[PDB]
Symmetry: D2
Subunit: 169 residues, 4 copies
Amino acid sequence: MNMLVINGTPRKHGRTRIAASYIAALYHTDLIDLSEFVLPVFNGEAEQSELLKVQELKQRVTKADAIVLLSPEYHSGMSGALKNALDFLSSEQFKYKPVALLAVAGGGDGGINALNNMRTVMRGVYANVIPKQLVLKPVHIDVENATVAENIKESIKELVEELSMFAKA
Amino acid sequence: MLVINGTPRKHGRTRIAASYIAALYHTDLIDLSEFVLPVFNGEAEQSELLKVQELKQRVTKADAIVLLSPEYHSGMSGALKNALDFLSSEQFKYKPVALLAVAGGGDGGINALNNMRTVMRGVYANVIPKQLVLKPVHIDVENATVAENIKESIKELVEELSMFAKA
Amino acid sequence: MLVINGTPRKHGRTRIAASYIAALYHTDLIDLSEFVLPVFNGEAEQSELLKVQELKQRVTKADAIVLLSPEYHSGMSGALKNALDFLSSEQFKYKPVALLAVAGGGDGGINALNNMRTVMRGVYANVIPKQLVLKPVHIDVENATVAENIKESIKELVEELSMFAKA
Amino acid sequence: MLVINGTPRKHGRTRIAASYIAALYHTDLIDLSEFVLPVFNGEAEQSELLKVQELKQRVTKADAIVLLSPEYHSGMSGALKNALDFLSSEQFKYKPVALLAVAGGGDGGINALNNMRTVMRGVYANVIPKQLVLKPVHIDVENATVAENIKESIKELVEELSMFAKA
Ligand SMILES: Cc1cc2nc3c(=O)[nH]c(=O)nc-3n(C[C@H](O)[C@H](O)[C@H](O)COP(=O)(O)O)c2cc1C
Ligand SMILES: Cc1cc2nc3c(=O)[nH]c(=O)nc-3n(C[C@H](O)[C@H](O)[C@H](O)COP(=O)(O)O)c2cc1C
Ligand SMILES: Cc1cc2nc3c(=O)[nH]c(=O)nc-3n(C[C@H](O)[C@H](O)[C@H](O)COP(=O)(O)O)c2cc1C
Ligand SMILES: Cc1cc2nc3c(=O)[nH]c(=O)nc-3n(C[C@H](O)[C@H](O)[C@H](O)COP(=O)(O)O)c2cc1C
């Protein structure tokens, strides 16, 4: 298609999971849901590299032409679950890969810290993070309807479109 | 005082630095290379896990914490962040914390420190000014200890932490 | 206690916030809106100027500092950073500091806070955990003061700052 | 292509590095050590100033920018930030930008880079992945040029910048 969406929240009832679901559906992308895609904690031993899930993670990330990286803001940073998943990876999978960042925060001043955390880590693996970044609040998520609210759809639209533009370049 | 090793690798350099500090100053030690937690999932039953309970108790008990982490991809280890996701200001509020990052070289270290500092402030911890970046040259793997060159810097770090803790 | 207004704009919101704190908590006040310093150039003759001498002297004399800044382009004001460039850990070492940023809206505020935080610890200052982001809704321009909705948040900020100062 | 020297010091190392790049790739050059601006105050009259109009014009016409800055107190120079405060996304939107920071050594460099990356993204610029930290060893002051050991890295940096600009 050939885009990929990664849900960074490990909570099955997490808001980030809903945002990711919507994007994956509307824009016909691959979807990695960390709430369902449970990895072991990276520990650096050889057998972990043989793990089915680990090989799948690498495979699906490499084939992606562009990645929408979503994460909830936990303690002013990305989820430990998402960071752990990335710890299995490297520039091998991310080099020059167009990445759009989206953080789901709960409080008032939350969101930017998670984004910066993700941007720094992504740049660390030589990814190409696009300028436009998005912070979602509870008001942007329609839990009862398992989708995002109308108020945020335009922003997401622009995010994905800018990502696609960088991907074509 | 409590020392927390943020590297999940049993052979990690960060574990060596953490062990040295813990033994030299007779502190409590939480070693994430042995202290294995499930990946946070936000479930209530998970938060009731004995290990999670233990983590909370030992952190809140601590008068001061030396927080060590390797730099993985310009940030703290996922293992450490995952452990922290189980916790909150209830365990960290106003608690004196000293930051130490072990990087593989180059320009590594600061990103991990900043990541940790931001997260710790997020849980209302009292992060002291002095922060330390260790490189492979500062670690003696053969003898499973730190190199002589960094010992004074570590001493300065701990003593400043103690100063903030007693104040 | 010393309050520093980071906004160079005479009509800026940050100036209103700063003036409020200085007035109600009877503190010293450095207003970069009219405390005009030249652009740092590293020349020795600059440190001879009475304003920079005054800046250094009032910072060292302060028992605790409330550092306010607008968020310009996801960072602290150039005016404030320029003023800080004249200074160093000589004036800031272990200085209790509380951060406050004023943002135009949206997702602004945090970047300026982090910027100031990183710079402040860079000069070895003791930045307290509690930090504030003020939005237009927190500023009562018509009455040239802060809104009632933010007064006790500031109160808490000053309280925590004082606590760190006493200890 | 445009090269911006962030150091306001006429004898700054950053000025040396900037001059090397500007001459090697025959680029435009804005030298803040001699391109003096007033402290931004937000008043309409300032935008009438020749230097301000010049700054805006030369930035917009640039197809790519190499942004250099010394690390002052774990951040970009106040001189550079002040200059950027005059500008906005109107001049930087989708502009390819390569970051380079000159640090006095130690753990310095990353903080200045992060500061610049955050601010640049704040004005909607397109900051490339590759970033460079130059240290004293990478600068030959007596020869008024960069050391041979860093010439390759600088080349790779400019080449990646060109690639993103040709997109
Ligand atoms: C462990 C934990 C830490 C959190 N810390 C923050 C925070 O630092 N800032 C914030 O805005 N929200 C914070 N929240 C609230 C989340 O932003 C909120 O749950 C949001 O919906 C994203 O999380 P979710 O995708 O799992 O639902 C935290 C939530 C959890 C579970
Ligand atoms: C997954 C992973 C990512 C790493 N990324 C970085 C990096 O971003 N910057 C760096 O300086 N070193 C990096 N390294 C090297 C580590 O800093 C090095 O292993 C160091 O000894 C600390 O890790 P350790 O405690 O597990 O030994 C990375 C190592 C691993 C295993
Ligand atoms: C040059 C400039 C850049 C600005 N960039 C931002 C921004 O990055 N984020 C934001 O929330 N507000 C931004 N604003 C709006 C200010 O935050 C707003 O004016 C606020 O009141 C603080 O500035 P002040 O103290 O001068 O009033 C910017 C304002 C100016 C003058
Ligand atoms: C006001 C000031 C603050 C400085 N702070 C730092 C620092 O935070 N980290 C660092 O590595 N170097 C710092 N330095 C040293 C500079 O990195 C050094 O002068 C280097 O040559 C770059 O600055 P320059 O372009 O003016 O030469 C500082 C220098 C000055 C003048």
